[PDB]
Amino acid sequence: ERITPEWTAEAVIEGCAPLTPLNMTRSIAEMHMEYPPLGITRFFKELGYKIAKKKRKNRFVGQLIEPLRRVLERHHLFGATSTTPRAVFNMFRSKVDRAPVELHSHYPGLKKMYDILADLWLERYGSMKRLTEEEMASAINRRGAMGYQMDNRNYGDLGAYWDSGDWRQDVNTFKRALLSGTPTHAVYNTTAKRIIQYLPADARLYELKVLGGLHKYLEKCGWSVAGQGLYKYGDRVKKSMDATGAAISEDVAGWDTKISKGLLTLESHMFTKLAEDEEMAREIHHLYRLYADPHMVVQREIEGEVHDVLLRGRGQVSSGRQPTYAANTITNFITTTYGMAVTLGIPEADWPRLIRDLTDERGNRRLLVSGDDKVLFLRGDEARVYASSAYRISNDMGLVRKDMALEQESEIIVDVKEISFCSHRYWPVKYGNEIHYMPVRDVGEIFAKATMADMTQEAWARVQGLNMLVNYHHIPECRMLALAILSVTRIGLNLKGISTEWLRDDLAPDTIHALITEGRTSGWDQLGYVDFKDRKGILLRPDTNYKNWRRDLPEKVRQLREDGQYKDWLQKMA
Ligand SMILES: [Mg+2]
């Protein structure tokens, strides 16, 4: 039914530069809208639409696991078509087309904590430079799409665009138009996988250049796992639990869709504080003027006609933006620390020390944060105070917790192995005579992510094999699949084009022991396994289906090998 959304008033946040909309006329015209809007969204404002056109498994990994596909689909979460435009628009309306809560009483306290963190980072680490070309080359996804506004340049993917060097002039053109107040290439494209939003490739490279340094501060933070591999997370979870004794690990449903323009105004305020010069601050501020006023093209289908629909929102966070992870991590830390401080009655004059202590992993409160994922660690007495009322503050901000009633008290976790962080739990695994906590999740999810993405298909599989060996060797079916992947993929591929210490053809256990025990242990035989008794549930039961797959893996490896040079890794196991 034909709806005309009325947005609430905007928050006015003292001490912060407002994120005024840009002049979008040029960027809107670049999308070549044809018809006036239908208006069937409740929050997003439709500007117009045009007639469009309806928008596999890696062969190496996929064939290696094929004998297991049945048990993985039945007993695990492997789960294996393109989403129709009808379904795309239905999931946009269900999940994205929801107004953020702009108006609440928490901005002054949130600002205080953003300011404290910014002053701490500046005091200890200095201000933030734009990324260098070399840093940008390390961070790009070479397989990223170009965007409708860039499709008629025929680059294929980001990697080809990057190699051509043409982006150098385009990024400067993007910058100048943006700073004029009338950007080019500022309308988001979307694809369905959830719905991924992304600016054109030139805009994405500019974002990375300006805001990509935020990751460097996060690497210094004891509440962040930025730059650290998954094999380190369990020990961090254990260390945090040992100093506290109780954990609260709650997810927000659709975190990205709930971030307000008010929260974005705070992010911008903080990041301009960090910028290296005044022009950079203006660039960051102008990027956030774009972010807080997102325009995007989403598909739909009515009466058999496929539409490309131009929609305008307010606030929210787009997923296909490289700085998003770092900005999400910071805002998740601040909103969580704020709600905890207010709920526990920590006086505001102690908030600078509180944020320093969280950052230094000192005291008996700890956080671990990655994107929208967080675990809060507290002593039992404070955990009970937190669990019974901190949700009121996040509810006030629209940060509603997933899969629980609105005012349900938080579950207090007291067993380190029940803490979920970054979609894993962590179990103690023996390396020689020491213990390290290593990640586990449903093996169907592990295998699916290793399977669903030329010589880059082979290089991609090989990197999945190296990653699986490093992170999941303690799960027997994962170590086995990893060794099979490394036996069927050829030596000499460019893995770095596709995670530096171990991205090598000559990877050996000494590299893995260096990452986990700093080389106190050695050899294949000191790489631990989970106990046989626990090989069930999320892990593959070691029955005849597993054993037959293992039996036929050497033959399958020989059949999948082609003209390359290979080594036999399956003999490293049994
Ligand atoms: Mg969590």
Author numbering: 303 to 357, 363 to 387, 391 to 503, 519 to 778, 785 to 829, 836 to 911
What did the published study say regarding this structure?
The NSP1 RdRP exhibits a characteristic architectural feature commonly found in viral RdRPs, known as encircled right-hand architecture.
Although the FL construct did not yield any crystals, the D55 and D307 constructs produced crystals with flake-like and stick-like shapes, respectively. The initial determination of the structure of D55 involved the utilization of the SAD method, wherein Se-Met-substituted D55 crystals were employed. Subsequently, the structures of native D55 and D307 were resolved through molecular replacement, utilizing the Se-Met-derived D55 structure as the search model. The D55 crystal was found to be an N-terminal degraded D55 protein, but the precise N-terminus of the protein in the crystal was not determined. Due to the significant similarity between the native structures of D55 and D307, with a root-mean-square deviation (RMSD) value of merely 0.2 Å for all superimposable α-carbon atoms (with D307 structure as the reference, covering 99.5% of residues), we primarily utilize the 1.84-Å D307 structure for subsequent illustrations.
